[PDB]
Scaffold this active site. Sequence first.
Site, PDB file in Angstrom:
ATOM      1  N   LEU A  16       0.860  -1.197   0.000  1.00  0.00           N
ATOM      2  CA  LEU A  16       0.000   0.000   0.000  1.00  0.00           C
ATOM      3  C   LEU A  16       0.891   1.241   0.000  1.00  0.00           C
ATOM      4  O   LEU A  16       0.468   2.267  -0.509  1.00  0.00           O
ATOM      5  CB  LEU A  16      -0.932  -0.059   1.210  1.00  0.00           C
ATOM      6  N   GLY A  17       2.095   1.160   0.538  1.00  0.00           N
ATOM      7  CA  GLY A  17       2.894   2.369   0.745  1.00  0.00           C
ATOM      8  C   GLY A  17       4.209   2.052   1.420  1.00  0.00           C
ATOM      9  O   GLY A  17       4.379   0.936   1.963  1.00  0.00           O
ATOM     10  N   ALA A  20      10.597   5.850   5.117  1.00  0.00           N
ATOM     11  CA  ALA A  20      11.800   5.671   5.964  1.00  0.00           C
ATOM     12  C   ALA A  20      11.622   4.415   6.828  1.00  0.00           C
ATOM     13  O   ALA A  20      12.508   3.559   6.845  1.00  0.00           O
ATOM     14  CB  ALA A  20      11.985   6.893   6.824  1.00  0.00           C
ATOM     15  N   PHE A  21      10.459   4.279   7.460  1.00  0.00           N
ATOM     16  CA  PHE A  21      10.187   3.306   8.547  1.00  0.00           C
ATOM     17  C   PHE A  21      10.178   1.865   8.039  1.00  0.00           C
ATOM     18  O   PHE A  21      10.438   0.936   8.837  1.00  0.00           O
ATOM     19  CB  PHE A  21       8.849   3.621   9.206  1.00  0.00           C
ATOM     20  N   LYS A  23       7.440  -0.454   5.364  1.00  0.00           N
ATOM     21  CA  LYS A  23       6.302  -0.410   4.418  1.00  0.00           C
ATOM     22  C   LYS A  23       4.975  -0.733   5.105  1.00  0.00           C
ATOM     23  O   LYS A  23       4.959  -1.298   6.198  1.00  0.00           O
ATOM     24  CB  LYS A  23       6.555  -1.397   3.290  1.00  0.00           C
ATOM     25  N   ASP A 137       3.726  15.496  11.764  1.00  0.00           N
ATOM     26  CA  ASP A 137       4.016  15.054  10.355  1.00  0.00           C
ATOM     27  C   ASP A 137       2.747  15.001   9.536  1.00  0.00           C
ATOM     28  O   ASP A 137       2.495  14.005   8.839  1.00  0.00           O
ATOM     29  CB  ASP A 137       4.798  13.747  10.311  1.00  0.00           C
TER      30      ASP A 137
END
Length: 330
Positions: A16-17, A20-21, A23, A137
Site C-alpha cells: 500500500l505504501g 523511511a520506517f 512499508k 508530520d
Amino acid sequence: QSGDVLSARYEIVDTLGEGAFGKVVECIDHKAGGRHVAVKIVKNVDRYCEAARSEIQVLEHLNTTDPNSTFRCVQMLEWFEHHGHICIVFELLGLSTYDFIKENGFLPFRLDHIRKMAYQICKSVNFLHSNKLTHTDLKPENILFVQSDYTEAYNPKIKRDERTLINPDIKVVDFGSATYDDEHHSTLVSTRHYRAPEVILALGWSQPCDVWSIGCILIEYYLGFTVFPTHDSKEHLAMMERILGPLPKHMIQKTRKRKYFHHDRLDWDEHSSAGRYVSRRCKPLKEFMLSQDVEHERLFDLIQKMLEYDPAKRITLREALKHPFFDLLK
C-alpha cells in the site's frame, strides 16, 4: 515479500505504501474469513523500532479514549513482532489524499469535498491537541480516505473524465512522530513543504506546528500543487515572505539560524536565479484564489489564520472548528 505470512494468519498480497520506517502492506486474514487488513512492517533498525513502539503506545491511548474512532484516528487492531520487525495491524483504509489527487492528474478537490475533509482533519488533530499530543508530520500522504470508490462524469470545463468520491470521509495515520507535551521534542519535525517557520528557525514548537501543516495541506487540496516547490530552507523562507509578507522581527531576533539572515532581514537576492524562481512560482496568498465568492474567501481566511507566522498568534484547531468556512456542513 508478497506471499510471506505474519503471525501465522496475515498473508501479504500487496504494498500500500513505503517510507523511511519500512512499508505498509495489504494482507488476507486467513483466520477471519479471508477479509483484508493493513499491516505496517517496520524495519529492523533501532530508530524505526522506537518510533513503532511510540506509535503503538499513542494508538493504545487514542483507541482506549475513542474506541469507535469518532475523531478519525486510524484504528490499530493488534501488533506483534515478525523476524525482529514490529508489525502493526490496522483497519484497511483506501488511498491517501495524495494518491487520489495524483491518480486524478493533480486536479484539485471540489470546495465542498475540501470543506468536509478539512473539518475532519481539524476534528481529528484537535482530539490529539486535547490529549496533550502533537502529530508533527501532517501531510496529504498521512490523510487517507475510508473508501476511495469514485464515480466518473465527463467534465466539459477541462474536456476530460474526472473522478468524484462517493464518500470523502478520511482518517489520520502515522503516529510514529506524535509527541506528548512532557516528552523530548525533536529539533526538526514535519515534511519540508508542511513545516512551520518556528521549526525552520529552531525556536521550539508545540500544537501550533500542526496547524501550519494543515494550512499547507488545504492549499494543496485547493490548487493540486504546493505553493512551496522547494528543497532548501532559506528559499522556503523567501517563498513564505513572497506569499505571506515579511517574517516577524521577534522571530528573526530569536533564531540562531544566522546563515539565513543579513542584518535582521532574510539574506535573499530577488535578482539571483533562485530569486527569479521564487518571484515566478510564488505570489501573495489571496492571488491563488480561483474564485472571489464568499465560500472561497472564507477558506482563504482560515488558511491565512493557519499560516500566521507567530505560533502564539496562530489560530488553534478549537477556534478553527468554529470558522464560518465550516457552517455549510451543519
